[PDB]
Design a protein around this ligand. Sequence first.
Ligand SMILES: [Mg+2]
Ligand SMILES: [Mg+2]
Lengths: 256, 256
Amino acid sequence: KIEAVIFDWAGTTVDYGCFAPLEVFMEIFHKRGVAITAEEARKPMGLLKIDHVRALTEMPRIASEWNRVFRQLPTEADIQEMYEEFEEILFAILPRYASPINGVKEVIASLRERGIKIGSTTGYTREMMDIVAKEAALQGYKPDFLVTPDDVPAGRPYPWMCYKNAMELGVYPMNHMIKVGDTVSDMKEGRNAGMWTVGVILGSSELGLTEEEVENMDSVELREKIEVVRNRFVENGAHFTIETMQELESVMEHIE
Amino acid sequence: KIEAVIFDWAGTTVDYGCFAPLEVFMEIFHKRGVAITAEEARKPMGLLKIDHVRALTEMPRIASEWNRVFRQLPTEADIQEMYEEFEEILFAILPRYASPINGVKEVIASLRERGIKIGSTTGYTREMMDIVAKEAALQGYKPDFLVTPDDVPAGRPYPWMCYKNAMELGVYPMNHMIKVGDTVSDMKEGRNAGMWTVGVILGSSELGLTEEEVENMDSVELREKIEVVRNRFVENGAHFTIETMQELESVMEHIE
Ligand SMILES: [Mg+2]
Ligand SMILES: [Mg+2]
């Protein structure tokens, strides 16, 4: 029997498409003269903040209208500088990216009515979680427990945060707990903690799309884009994969 | 691949038969008309010494006599009095049982120069451990890290103290570590946390015999009482079986 399930935040239970970072970066470039495509910015997603900015600096169609504007090429100070402005802008807007993802509520309220327990981990800092968590409760969502990289020696990929959840909820053989996320980073955490690990595709920043794009998109442009993400999960630990949260119960039943 | 070993304290790395509590466990009970056997008092060994006494009240033979000299089953006072007394009598001799089982230091130095990290769990309360380590350290042993039942929500059988060691030593997968102790409760802690669980016998508590009592020991008596203990372990989740701790450096290479 699994006695607990452990969730991630942006891309899984909140922010469909996990655009929160996306708009900060977009702005940190628009505001400087350069306009950058949603496809440009969501490519280096996955690296650390600062390595995501030197990456936007080495794409040709970008250096090439920066040196049309400043008539020089991007600098180590320009990179050191675009980074500083990150936090503020993310704080500024975070209260707009904390809507619980569609249909997530109805499954959670279905897990508790079985006596299952609910924890969560994130990459966001404790000071960022002070906001997300607040607006999510207003809009309907509050896990049984919450941990951030600030409570442990190190964040994802290490399994430290998952162990805390085990202690706090009072559950112990780990393979008695399921872990659910929306990125490569999330699959690794789960394996390194000896937990059963799952992945979600729709609205998972890995996919990149917006609820509306997903519904009006061409039945064949969609299914092939999906398959890419499902492979990427699998190739990184993923024990199982799902399109939406509504199939989670079945992956629990499977496990037995 | 094992990067770490977690050791118990009494009867595993220091004392030799425990005993530091044995005599303090039988009087507090003799003082009240009840009589308890070294075998019975030695049964729940390993718990937090607060949880231990309690287990001695929930033994049907014992209760059958807390009800013979008193109606009343014992309750919270019959329990938090014998304890109050226990710490008084024990806090008077402790520093006499902080001596390393013969030739264990000799192992621990060979495991270190081989890069492995050594951590530990126990049943003593932080107050008590503060004393025993102080002496142990003088007479040879100070491990890399110590975690007591006072630093988490509960004690052996729960896996919380081990997860901690892990968090603090920097080792991931929970099977890259080897758990080692001298009681039944020690065998469960180990498997409840997904580690390699191994018990020691000669100089333990479920053998509760002396160093020199074990020298002047026949052979048809020695060769058997030791199976009586090698069978009490395995029946409670033991992966391996050792007679003295010079045979550990092998059950390591074996796991591979
Ligand atoms: Mg995510
Ligand atoms: Mg012991």
